[PDB]
């Protein structure tokens, strides 16, 4: 009756097959599992690549799945995601910086980027207010190539955050990544500009913590789960089942993920 939408973005067939087996064995057939390329709700996206239709890329440190090394840490990493076009077409994150060099008009693209940053900034400040932190950390790659997209990102993110009344501290990519992996307790809320390096940093943090499920906020309004490994996908499915209104099944999947990461399907 109900439907779970599986999106594949750069994920090996093994992970997708594992996810399908897990849901089928745990759900028992009550909720069907259909595959697609875009969704707004009841969706799990497998693979490092960012799907189409997501504007925010928040991720946290769930208490249940905290690794013993990272016990007690509490930091929220939100990556701003610009609208994604077809693979052949030039992405906005690159168009916004190259068209300016080429002299092409960049009005509509700026407007679209501004809207995406505002939504991401609103999500980040809401998380910061909920956690109670007073200052957030913006992350922008300091490469000369990305001298326009980051500039707009800073101009808008700081504007929205300052309007909300919180402080912003701008930093690069290498220093923040090292701090987040080594001393993450000194960062409460960190926003990341839309760059490939930032995406890798988000994945590394999601994996080093012990394997977690990232939350994507889409344009249509909602939250969709995202995973890249067996444990992360298993946690993503468990959260998705919990959202559908299944508590016991979600707990079983979470327990199986904690015990046997690479073979949860057989473990449960």
């Amino acid at each position: 009756s109900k439907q779970l939408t599986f999106i594949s973005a750069g994920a090996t067939a093994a992970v997708l097959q594992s996810a399908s087996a897990i849901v089928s064995k745990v759900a028992g057939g009550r909720v069907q599992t259909k595959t697609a390329k875009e969704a707004g709700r009841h969706a799990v996206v497998v693979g490092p690549e960012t799907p189409i239709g997501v504007h925010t890329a928040v991720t946290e440190v769930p208490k249940s799945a905290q690794d013993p090394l990272f016990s007690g840490v509490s930091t929220v990493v939100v990556r701003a995601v610009l609208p994604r076009a077809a693979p052949d077409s030039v992405q906005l994150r690159d168009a916004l910086d190259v068209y300016a060099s080429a002299g092409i008009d960049t009005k509509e693209e700026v407007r679209s980027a501004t809207e995406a940053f505002k939504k991401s900034a609103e999500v980040a400040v809401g998380k910061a207010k909920a956690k109670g932190v007073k200052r957030i950390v913006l992350v922008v790659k300091q490469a000369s190539k990305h001298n326009c997209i980051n500039e707009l990102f800073k101009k808008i993110s700081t504007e929205t955050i300052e309007s909300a009344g919180l402080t912003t501290e701008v930093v690069g990519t290498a220093a923040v990544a090292n701090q987040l992996i080594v001393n993450p307790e000194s960062l409460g809320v960190v926003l990341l500009n839309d760059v490939a390096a930032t995406e890798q940093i988000e994945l590394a943090f999601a994996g080093v913590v012990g394997g977690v499920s990232r939350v994507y906020h889409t344009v249509e309004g909602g939250k969709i789960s995202a995973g890249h490994s067996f444990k992360s996908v298993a946690l993503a499915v468990a959260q998705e089942l919990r959202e559908l209104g299944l508590s016991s099944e979600a707990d079983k999947v979470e327990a199986a993920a904690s015990k046997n990461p690479r073979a949860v399907v057989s473990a449960l």
Binding site: Q142, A143, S144, K145, G172, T173, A174, A175, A177, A197
Partner: peptide, 15 residues
């Protein structure tokens, strides 16, 4: 030339 400038910027900052 742009690639070389990007490479040098990456080396100085780190990544």
């Amino acid at each position: 030339d742009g690639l070389s400038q990007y490479d040098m910027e990456e080396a100085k900052y780190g990544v």
